[model samples]
Target: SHMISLIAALAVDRVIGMENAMPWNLPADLAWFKRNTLNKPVIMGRHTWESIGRPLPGRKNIILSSQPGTDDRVTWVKSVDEAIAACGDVPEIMVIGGGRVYEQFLPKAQKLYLTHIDAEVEGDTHFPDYEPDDWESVFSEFHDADAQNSHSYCFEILERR
Candidate 1:
């Protein structure tokens, strides 16, 4: 299946990260990412791979990069369709992020797994503010800030337009 799913934590104004690493710490958000992405085919851009320094274990990683990677465990591609092909016939391809590549895949992605962090701060990177009506929420929840987190968040999973 060519189905693509994207996941990111965007604080108010869609800020996805800061200087490669994320700007905020959300233990619950990390857990959500881990649970959903584990054992799936994940596609992340070069910056994300370099920042992490290795493939996220247990999943086939398709890294969108221009140069050949030093790490042999992950597959590398320079563009969209190439990444899709590297994913093979896997049931769903996950677009894990550092923000830039999110815009490229947003047009074709079939599902959105997003957490909207309800706080204000500055970050160099952000997820796209794709047209709202284009998505139909399949599941949604509001989680308040607690001992484990410093900010409130809204998690939503939405399907096609």
Candidate 2:
């Protein structure tokens, strides 16, 4: 099952951030996100990598960067080709990022894991648009702050058309 999955928190309008951070902190969503993505290789853009503050423990970090030899837990690369090459034979990869990173991986992604936060975030960053009609919604559930453990969000799993 060679597939690339995406994980993001978006608003009803599909907005992620006006800046790099969230408008509100949703702890439950964060816990759920970590639980699901742990141990998987997560590919992210340079900016998004920085936005997240530190390397996510238990996950292999693949940072997409044009710069050479950047140190961190991240394996930096100049292009998507390099990222894929570095990903090796991992059966599944998570394309986690800001806008640019998502754009780069969208065509190659086979599945999407998204959190549709109930409110719109006024940020410059946004998640990639997925046509509901094109992809099959394999899983979905609504969650509140207490249950989600952090912010208001809904989880969804979609398979590509």
Candidate 3:
């Protein structure tokens, strides 16, 4: 079975987006994301694709959308189930998203790789809130803000219970 991983960076207030982008900048976190998701199937919403401007190189970009599809470099799935089916035999499929896509996959996520930023941000987009009882923390590491990073955050991995 393909493992579903929901990855996101959220502020203390659970804001995941601001001005159509992440509220903070953390180079290390970005590197960590690329290192883990590269060459893997990454499923995201149409807005996520538009945010990146194109398919991520070295990874299978799967976008969930209903509009008349017209991209050759990326695969378009009409729904989350269709996206999962398109993942095929990949060992893991990463859901990298916009709020709606995260909400659609939250119930099905088996793992969560999140960066919890220690800052309050004002944003219209937020990561879906989940019950803590349903998951167990498997890994975590705290990073302080430095010249290369914008703010403090904790990298956490949780497994479904």
Candidate 4:
């Protein structure tokens, strides 16, 4: 209740996604994402909302879309605070995102979990920039998915200074 974590992607050149679609596949990473975020609320933007096709199972989805519509699994809102409020008193909240949504919430976030990819594919989406000196690295693990045709990447967690 006192803290929130951010989840994002960054490439070797710090690219996140060319479009909303990921350039690589990492089942382990996807599993990790699901495991970490299960039963919590995942906040995301319109484009990112579209990329996923539908809401993730076992979690609540707070989608920031201006479409003014509804889904059986999603609560659509126009702003971040509105989205957060819609989640009610969940034990934890994850900013599961688009570049704009991440940038908007980064300054107020207390912790960050980033999946760092090994290659730099040209990407239109990007995570926000934080002053390196301002974040304290709390944990990191590297995984190579090359044998499965995926790339190597690191799962890193950082706390705000």
RMSD of each: 1.9, 2.6, 1.8, 2.2
Task: Residues 1-161, candidate 1: write the lDDT tens digits.
Answer: 76999988877656464242443367888888889998899999888887778778899998998888778888989889999899988888999885778988999898999888887767667687678788898998899988878888888899988
**Lowest-lDDT window of 10 residues in candidate 3?**
15-24
Order the candidates by TM-score, highest first — what do you get?
A: 3, 1, 4, 2
Per-candidate TM-scores read: 0.90, 0.85, 0.92, 0.88
lDDT of each: 0.82, 0.74, 0.83, 0.76
Instruction: Give the per-residue lDDT digits (tens) of candidate 2, residues 42-156.
Output: 8888877766668888778888887775565678888887887777787888877767788788878888877787765556655766677878999999877774345667888
lDDT of 4 by residue, 1-161 (tens): 72567887777535463252454466666776778898888888888777667788878888887788556668889876787788788777898777888888887788898888776666666677889999999999998766653778889999988
Candidate 4, which ten residues in sequence have the lowest lDDT sum? 13-22
State the displacement of the C-alpha of residue 152, model 4, in Å, after optimal TM-score superposition.
0.9
Q: Distance (Å) between predicted and true CA of 3, model 1?
A: 0.6
Sort order, lDDT high to low = 3, 1, 4, 2
Q: State residue 130's C-alpha deviation in candidate 3, in Å.
A: 1.3
Off by over 4 Å in 2: 13-24, 147-151
lDDT of 1: 0.82
Model 2 earns a TM-score of 0.85
**Winning model by TM-score:** 3
Q: Candidate 2 vs candidate 4: which has greater TM-score? A: 4
Backbone clashes in model 3: 0
| Residue pairs in candidate 1 whose N, alpha carbon or C atoms collide under 3 angstroms | none
**What value of lDDT does candidate 2 attain over all alpha carbons?**
0.74
